[PDB]
Symmetry: C4
């Protein structure tokens, strides 16, 4: 259960470093510092305005931005679901 929570933190930092690099210069309010990034990725992770509010405007500059965001969503939603059941089994 704790191994999954650690794995998520590692994945979350790698993607926030990557996003900062790719979309920072073009989208500064969303991916400027690594701090702005980790916040935006959590927002995308909870699904809140992920497409109409972040991905669609980003794709208007980077047409393949979906190759980054869609897998990140599928991964973090699977990891969170796997982490959720870990607590369920332990009880």
């Amino acid at each position: 259960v704790g191994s999954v929570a650690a794995l998520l933190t590692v994945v979350f930092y790698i993607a926030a470093v990557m996003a900062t690099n790719l979309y920072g210069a073009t989208f500064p309010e969303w991916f400027g510092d690594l701090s702005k990034s980790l916040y935006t990725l959590f927002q995308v992770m909870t699904l809140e305005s992920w497409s109409m509010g972040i991905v669609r405007p980003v794709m208007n500059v980077h047409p393949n931005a979906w190759v980054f965001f869609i897998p990140f969503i599928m991964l973090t939603a699977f990891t969170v679901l796997n982490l959720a059941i870990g607590i369920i089994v332990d009880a």
Copy 2:
């Protein structure tokens, strides 16, 4: 578990072909190419701006668009939930 993941991909391509056909000419940024469709159907699948963002503007041209989108949502949300538990049982 893998049989459900394959079934979802087949259903996702059939609906992405159908939407392209029905709402393509009228809503090109959302359903123009099959690719544009697959992206918008995933957005609808995650529930992100499905109604206010997509369905409501579409229904202003196609008043029965809800006959397509509502079942797609109920189906994909059931399939994902069934796929989620498949991994849980196997653990």
Copy 3:
């Protein structure tokens, strides 16, 4: 499992009759016919733009609209969660 699915349909029709009555005259695009209602309640049920997009504008006319929507959300989210596990137990 089927008893819960029937219970939800009964609850969904009662609330769509009630909403049509309360907020129809003031909010016609959202609660005009019972048809417009059943669509909006499903949108609220999936959580899509429930507060900023429906409840907050409604409360600007009906300050207690939250007494209707919040319980409907808590009820339908519990019923769907109970219906979800029903399929899980049967497998």
Copy 4:
């Protein structure tokens, strides 16, 4: 199961008192009265427009508002998930 539901109500009132205090004077429509707060915290709890709708505009005045909202989200989403499974185990 009932102990978790009581714990959530206590946590929801403490955060609703805190938010009222911190973001009340600056954001009155969202955190003016404790009542206005309890409604906005539930909206954030369901994830509806949490970031683009509330947190991002709040952070434009209080740059560290994320220290309050992100943990509240992680806590209430864990508590609700734990409360959900409590009913599942008892069945």
